[PDB]
Amino acid sequence: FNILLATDSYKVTHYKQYPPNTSKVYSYFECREYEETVFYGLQYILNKYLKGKVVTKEKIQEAKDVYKEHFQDDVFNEKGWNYILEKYDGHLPIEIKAVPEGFVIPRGNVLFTVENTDPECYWLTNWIETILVQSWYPITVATNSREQKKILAKYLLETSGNLDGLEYKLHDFGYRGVSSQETAGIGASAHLVNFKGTDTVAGLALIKKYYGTKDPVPGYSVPAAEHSTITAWGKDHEKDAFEHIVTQFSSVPVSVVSDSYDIYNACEKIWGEDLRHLIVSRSTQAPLIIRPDSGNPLDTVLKVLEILGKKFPVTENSKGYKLLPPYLRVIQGDGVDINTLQEIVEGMKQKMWSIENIAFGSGGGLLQKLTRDLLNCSFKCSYVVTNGLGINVFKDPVADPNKRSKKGRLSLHRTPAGNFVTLEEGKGDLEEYGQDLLHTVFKNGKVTKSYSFDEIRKNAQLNI
Numbered sequence: 001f002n003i004l005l006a007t008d009s010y011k012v013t014h015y016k017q018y019p020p021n022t023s024k025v026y027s028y029f030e031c032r033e034y035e036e037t038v039f040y041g042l043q044y045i046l047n048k049y050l051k052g053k054v055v056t057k058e059k060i061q062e063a064k065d066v067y068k069e070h071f072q073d074d075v076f077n078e079k080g081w082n083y084i085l086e087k088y089d090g091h092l093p094i095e096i097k098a099v100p101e102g103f104v105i106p107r108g109n110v111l112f113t114v115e116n117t118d119p120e121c122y123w124l125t126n127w128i129e130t131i132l133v134q135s136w137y138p139i140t141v142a143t144n145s146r147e148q149k150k151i152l153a154k155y156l157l158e159t160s161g162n163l164d165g166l167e168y169k170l171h172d173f174g175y176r177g178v179s180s181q182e183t184a185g186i187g188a189s190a191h192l193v194n195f196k197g198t199d200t201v202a203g204l205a206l207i208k209k210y211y212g213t214k215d216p217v218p219g220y221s222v223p224a225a226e227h228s229t230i231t232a233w234g235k236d237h238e239k240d241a242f243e244h245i246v247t248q249f250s251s252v253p254v255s256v257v258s259d260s261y262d263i264y265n266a267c268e269k270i271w272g273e274d275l276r277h278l279i280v281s282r283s284t285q286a287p288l289i290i291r292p293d294s295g296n297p298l299d300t301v302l303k304v305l306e307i308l309g310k311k312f313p314v315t316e317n318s319k320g321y322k323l324l325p326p327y328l329r330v331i332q333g334d335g336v337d338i339n340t341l342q343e344i345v346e347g348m349k350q351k352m353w354s355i356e357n358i359a360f361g362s363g364g365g366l367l368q369k370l371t372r373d374l375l376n377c378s379f380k381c382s383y384v385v386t387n388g389l390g391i392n393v394f395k396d397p398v399a400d401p402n403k404r405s406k407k408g409r410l411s412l413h414r415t416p417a418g419n420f421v422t423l424e425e426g427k428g429d430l431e432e433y434g435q436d437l438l439h440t441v442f443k444n445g446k447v448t449k450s451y452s453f454d455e456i457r458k459n460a461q462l463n464i
């Protein structure tokens with residue numbers, strides 16, 4: 001990894017564009033006015049890419065050679081990068097202040113600030129905008145996942161009277177559905193801030209290495225089938241596939257994809273009749289989990305439950321909601337996103353089915369169908385020191401007031417009613433509010449404050 005080759009190309013030319021005699025460039029990140037966001041991911045970036053000796057004579061030579069061909073001109077700031085190498089042993093003269101990880105902050109608030117600590121490195125602040133702005137992705141995954149936890153919490157409490165097993169209601173199925181191995185690890189770790197169920201194994205190593213838990217692992221899984229392990233038996237032998245799989249995992253929970261040919265036939269005739277004796281004998285700690293995996297997600301879930309409800313002993317819980325026996329459950333993991341998740345639980349409640357009957361799996365909806373525009377994650381310069389004088393800078397495009405940026409030195413505070421406020425123009429210096437919630441997490445190539453994955457999960461908890 002070479003940080004000199006880890007920026008937007010045009011940023012290579014920006015050192016020549018700042019007003020002459022600029023000693024400071026101060027920038028901040030926000031999720032411009034999903035009312036509140038989970039701040040998560042920055043610590044990974046600081047350790048992986050920004051800390052320690054990030055500049056060497058070889059990295060300067062490599063960047064110089066690439067940029068000469070890429071621009072068909074000499075525009076690369078070799079003197080600037082050589083200054084960092086010689087003065088600071090390749091350590092970045094940068095200071096990063098950030099809200100603690102796991103913190104749930106409303107939109108339009110300062111989340112982190114970036115500034116150079118050496119006047120010669122005025123251009124460095126925004127060189128690292130590209131790398132830091134990528135924090136939009138763990139923030140958006142964590143926020144979107146927590147928003148789904150809110151819907152699940154609401155319907156589970158309404159239909160069962162408690163939140164038992166809530167942390168296992170939304171399982172990460174997204175490993176294949178993401179853009180890369182690195183994305184898989186980041187995205188799966190962001191989902192684990194809110195839930196305990198994951199199939200994206202990559203998230204586990206990321207958490208262990210960069211964050212850490214008291215528990216051996218942050219996430220869990222159970223044995224399960226795929227279309228290949230069912231279909232390999234042959235179309236006429238689907239019952240043999242089902243029987244072999246539940247017998248192999250007779251003492252632990254097991255999920256079986258039952259839609260290879262006919263989901264409704266599998267539920268009513270295979271599970272409901274032919275193999276019913278292998279299901280009713282299962283323990284409460286080892287249920288059979290039936291997975292439908294095609295068709296309209298709501299219509300399939302409702303039809304599956306109605307079939308099962310007629311083949312198996314159904315009870316009525318204390319809230320008046322239908323409950324399948326404890327050895328039988330359902331998992332819907334096809335076409336699941338925040339919108340379809342809301343449709344399914346609402347449809348289930350209307351048909352008097354308890355939410356304890358179902359669990360969800362989400363792949364692309366959880367980890368990939370997200371963009372930087374969803375929470376309007378933005379990095380902008382708010383303050384500059386030129387000719388020894390600090391000036392408050394901002395953008396204010398005529399055609400879009402939403403793109404108006406914050407002015408001057410920023411700080412984050414708790415208001416008297418316990419809400420949040422971002423103070424602009426250095427007004428935090430007048431101690432009218434509390435202590436600034438931003439902490440220095442990075443300074444001069446060193447990580448100065450870190451959080452465990454346990455602290456992050458505690459910070460990101462739902463009020464309930």
Ligand SMILES: CCCc1cc(=O)[nH]c(Nc2ccccc2F)n1
Nearest residue numbers: 171173199221222223224255256291
């Ligand atoms: C309940 C956790 C175990 C489980 C149950 C299940 O039916 N499927 C899976 N995983 C899965 C399915 C489709 C795509 C990608 C995936 F990782 N894991």
